[PDB]
Protein backbone atom coordinates (compact mmCIF):
# COMPACT_ATOMS: atom_id res chain seq x y z
CA UNK A 1 0.00 0.00 0.00
CA UNK A 2 2.65 2.72 -1.60
CA UNK A 3 1.49 6.35 -2.47
CA UNK A 4 5.14 6.85 -4.52
CA UNK A 5 2.73 9.22 -7.20
CA UNK A 6 1.76 11.85 -4.26
CA UNK A 7 5.86 11.36 -3.01
CA UNK A 8 7.01 12.04 -7.13
CA UNK A 9 6.49 15.63 -6.50
CA UNK A 10 6.61 15.92 -2.05
CA UNK A 11 10.32 14.58 -2.59
CA UNK A 12 10.91 16.48 -6.43
CA UNK A 13 10.10 20.24 -5.54
CA UNK A 14 11.78 18.95 -1.91
CA UNK A 15 14.76 17.79 -3.54
CA UNK A 16 14.56 21.19 -5.95
CA UNK A 17 15.51 23.52 -3.42
CA UNK A 18 17.42 20.68 -1.15
CA UNK A 19 20.00 21.22 -4.25
CA UNK A 20 19.62 25.26 -4.58
CA UNK A 21 19.87 25.36 -0.89
CA UNK A 22 23.10 22.71 -0.93
CA UNK A 23 21.22 20.65 1.86
CA UNK A 24 21.03 17.35 -0.12
CA UNK A 25 24.03 15.96 1.84
CA UNK A 26 22.28 17.16 5.17
CA UNK A 27 18.49 16.44 3.83
CA UNK A 28 19.83 13.18 3.41
CA UNK A 29 19.52 12.15 6.93
CA UNK A 30 16.27 14.55 7.26
CA UNK A 31 14.21 11.51 4.96
CA UNK A 32 15.95 8.86 6.35
CA UNK A 33 15.26 10.15 10.01
CA UNK A 34 11.75 11.33 8.75
CA UNK A 35 11.27 7.78 7.08
CA UNK A 36 13.06 6.08 9.94
CA UNK A 37 10.28 7.24 12.27
CA UNK A 38 7.43 6.51 10.21
CA UNK A 39 7.88 3.16 9.96
CA UNK A 40 8.10 2.33 13.58
CA UNK A 41 4.50 0.98 14.60
CA UNK A 42 3.94 3.52 17.39
CA UNK A 43 4.59 6.23 14.77
CA UNK A 44 1.91 4.87 12.39
CA UNK A 45 -0.43 4.41 15.70
CA UNK A 46 0.27 8.44 15.77
CA UNK A 47 0.26 8.99 12.19
CA UNK A 48 -3.69 6.87 12.33
CA UNK A 49 -5.11 9.08 14.57
CA UNK A 50 -8.78 10.06 15.08
CA UNK A 51 -9.10 11.58 11.58
CA UNK A 52 -6.29 14.08 13.14
CA UNK A 53 -3.93 15.60 10.63
CA UNK A 54 -2.64 18.16 12.80
CA UNK A 55 -1.86 15.30 15.51
CA UNK A 56 -0.15 13.32 13.02
CA UNK A 57 1.77 16.34 12.03
CA UNK A 58 2.56 18.09 14.95
CA UNK A 59 3.35 15.31 16.88
CA UNK A 60 5.93 14.00 13.96
CA UNK A 61 7.55 17.29 13.82
CA UNK A 62 8.02 16.80 17.86
CA UNK A 63 8.93 12.75 17.55
CA UNK A 64 10.82 13.50 14.92
CA UNK A 65 13.38 16.48 16.78
CA UNK A 66 13.44 20.38 15.98
CA UNK A 67 16.48 19.25 13.28
CA UNK A 68 13.62 19.52 10.90
CA UNK A 69 14.41 22.47 7.23
CA UNK A 70 11.36 24.68 7.37
CA UNK A 71 10.59 22.89 4.11
CA UNK A 72 11.08 19.39 6.14
CA UNK A 73 8.85 21.01 8.87
CA UNK A 74 6.09 22.04 6.48
CA UNK A 75 6.27 18.60 3.94
CA UNK A 76 5.55 16.59 7.26
CA UNK A 77 2.45 18.62 7.94
CA UNK A 78 1.57 19.15 3.44
CA UNK A 79 1.56 15.34 4.04
CA UNK A 80 -0.29 15.53 6.83
CA UNK A 81 -2.76 17.63 5.66
CA UNK A 82 -3.11 15.80 2.73
CA UNK A 83 -3.70 12.57 4.91
CA UNK A 84 -0.37 11.16 2.87
CA UNK A 85 2.33 11.60 6.35
CA UNK A 86 2.85 7.58 5.84
CA UNK A 87 4.13 8.11 2.50
CA UNK A 88 7.14 9.79 4.15
CA UNK A 89 9.51 6.49 2.33
CA UNK A 90 8.04 6.80 -1.00
CA UNK A 91 9.41 10.73 -0.43
CA UNK A 92 13.10 9.09 0.94
CA UNK A 93 13.29 6.52 -2.05
CA UNK A 94 12.16 9.03 -4.92
CA UNK A 95 14.54 11.86 -3.08
CA UNK A 96 17.71 8.40 -3.06
CA UNK A 97 17.02 8.39 -7.17
CA UNK A 98 17.00 12.20 -7.64
CA UNK A 99 20.14 12.35 -5.36
CA UNK A 100 21.47 9.97 -7.80
CA UNK A 101 20.50 11.69 -11.10
CA UNK A 102 21.44 15.22 -10.09
CA UNK A 103 25.07 13.72 -9.22
CA UNK A 104 25.15 12.12 -12.83
CA UNK A 105 23.26 14.55 -14.45
Known amino acids: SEFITVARPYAKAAFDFAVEHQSVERWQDMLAFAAEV ?7 ELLSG ?3 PETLAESFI ?7 DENGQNLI ?4 ENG ?3 ALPDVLEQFIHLR ?3 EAT
Do not use: D, F, Y
Not at 38 to 44: R, S
Open 38 to 44: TKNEQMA
Open 77 to 80: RVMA
Open 100 to 102: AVS
Open 50 to 52: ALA
Open 62 to 68: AVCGEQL
Open 84 to 86: RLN
